[PDB]
Design a protein around this ligand. Sequence first.
Ligand code: HEM
Ligand code: HEM
Ligand code: HEM
Ligand code: HEM
Lengths: 146, 146, 141, 141
Amino acid sequence: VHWSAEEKQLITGLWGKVNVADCGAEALARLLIVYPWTQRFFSSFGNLSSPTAILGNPMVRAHGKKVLTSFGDAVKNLDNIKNTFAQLSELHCDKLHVDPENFRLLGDILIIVLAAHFAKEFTPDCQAAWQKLVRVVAHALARKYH
Amino acid sequence: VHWSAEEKQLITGLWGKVNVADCGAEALARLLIVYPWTQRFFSSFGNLSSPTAILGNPMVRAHGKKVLTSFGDAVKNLDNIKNTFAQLSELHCDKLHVDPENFRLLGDILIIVLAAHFAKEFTPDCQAAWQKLVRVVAHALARKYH
Amino acid sequence: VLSAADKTNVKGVFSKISGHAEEYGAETLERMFTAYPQTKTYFPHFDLQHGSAQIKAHGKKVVAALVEAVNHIDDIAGALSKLSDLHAQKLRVDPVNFKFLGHCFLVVVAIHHPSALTAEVHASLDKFLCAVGTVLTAKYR
Amino acid sequence: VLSAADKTNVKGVFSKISGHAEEYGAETLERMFTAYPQTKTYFPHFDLQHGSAQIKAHGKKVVAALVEAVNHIDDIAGALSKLSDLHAQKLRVDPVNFKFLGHCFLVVVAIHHPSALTAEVHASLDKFLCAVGTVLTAKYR
Ligand code: HEM
Ligand code: HEM
Ligand code: HEM
Ligand code: HEM
């Protein structure tokens, strides 16, 4: 993909502010809550019996931040995502067999979460920049199926 | 992508039997009938007022075979689809702005059509081979959006 | 929701395949595993070798249920409430796989009753399956 | 279909945004055109420059309708029958775009009432929108 000089600006700045801990937890939680079927891939996390029972789960919260800091490597070299996630695509594709449709799903929630934490600093241009990032990442994860 | 030696066999043989005229028409027709919204991109075809009013439309039938013979170039060099459809992806992406989701849709109908014309000669292995082709083609058409 | 016509067409094409549950169900399943291999993930405990007794038995059950839904095509939810629990709450089946199964089913009908699957029915059948698949995961709706 | 809870949650978060149709509608629209540019294709006749009177007027209309649907959250179809004609039969809006608009809407609520959009409501809102979008293209169901 091609990244305009501002797109990078927009992304790396916001990155510096992001609390991967809170955002990451908030996101993985919401994914499990809104799209229930995703719970299947996290049977190893014990209780997911209820929404509120999920916000608290520390395994959810832990993995949440782990997933989010991966984007840290994306922002690292926005012109090398494919190669930096091949191994990541490999397990999600050949191992877990996650349907690419869920990558899209998570990416969307992630956007909403950022919008709630940076309020008015999450400008339309900014939203678009992350939308793009989120998709170019999922395309790097998918790919392994083609 | 990687094509097993039989996948190619399975594909090129069936290709030789295919009546692009009937199949192509049958297909584009069904797409318009099952997923109505697609009609929007074919406003230039006049009447599409009814199912039966569509089977007959000669513009539908004409374009139907045109779309199907394109697969002829696919079968041509199953290891070069991307480069051979770049110009095809360009108009579908930058020009018409067809959402990739419809490429999937058409590909599916195409499969069903073949299954009705070759009956029991359309073996599971054969279905899988075309499924693959159909998807690797749509991925070549999409791509232009990423 | 399914219109009157949609209901009529669905009933029609099912009249032609009735008496083949065993055979067709087994075929759509085998085509699903063959073209959408990742769907295998849901049947570790299944004998997947072509023409297995399991696949046949299950095949028959699957279409038997779709048939059951046609008889109560006015209350698909009620008719399959017990199965939506199973596929949604229990197995947590990804809504995406329901597409693969419906697809293969249409392929099977096309091969054996190409005259029964006119384009009009094709659309009625498609709305039927999205409706069914909705309910079967629909717990989320 | 929407459960009792889902209905309650939807009503709740709409109580907090009510009195902002004009403002929010305009914002979700602008975010949609900005992040999903291809959606522009449907408004050649629109003044798309940020903060345009058209976008504001339409924005207001859009949410005004979503609100209307909440008041009749028991018969969304009836409530929007006239609009499903428009978006389905007339404009032939690709069902895929309804996703883009609902997404942006949630982004707008998140930015202004982050407390009002708890994860529970988030799910209720999501089922509401898929329901609405279904009906608005649903002519095909
Ligand atoms: C593009 C978004 C995503 C990114 C960046 C991502 C990233 C990661 C990372 C960094 C790991 C590392 C290995 C580990 O700690 O286990 C992981 C594991 C995993 N991911 Fe994701 N993931 C994404 C989307 C998804 C989705 C949508 C699902 C499906 C519900 C999923 C399911 C899993 C599972 C089940 C594991 C195994 C974790 C474990 O071993 O407990 N991921 N992911
Ligand atoms: C992968 C499947 C597809 C292939 C192989 C394909 C191929 C073609 C070809 C070969 C043309 C050549 C130029 C021409 O004769 O106009 C064409 C034009 C076009 N295609 Fe497709 N197409 C595909 C899917 C779609 C879908 C899903 C739609 C959307 C409803 C679509 C809409 C069009 C339109 C509107 C044109 C313009 C035709 C005209 O100018 O009258 N195509 N396509
Ligand atoms: C509308 C299509 C479908 C129908 C009507 C359907 C129906 C059924 C039925 C009737 C059973 C019950 C067996 C019994 O209790 O005797 C069942 C079980 C099950 N279904 Fe499906 N199903 C459909 C789609 C799916 C899909 C998309 C998948 C997976 C890709 C799936 C996975 C399963 C699994 C794994 C079981 C396991 C039962 C066992 O352990 O033998 N189903 N389904
Ligand atoms: C649930 C979300 C949506 C709602 C409730 C909605 C509602 C409306 C309303 C109320 C109007 C009527 C204007 C009037 O008659 O005064 C309208 C018009 C229209 N809608 Fe939407 N809409 C939605 C989604 C979409 C989407 C996804 C698109 C396009 C990407 C779209 C494209 C249009 C267009 C182009 C018109 C044109 C009206 C004009 O010429 O000014 N709508 N919509």
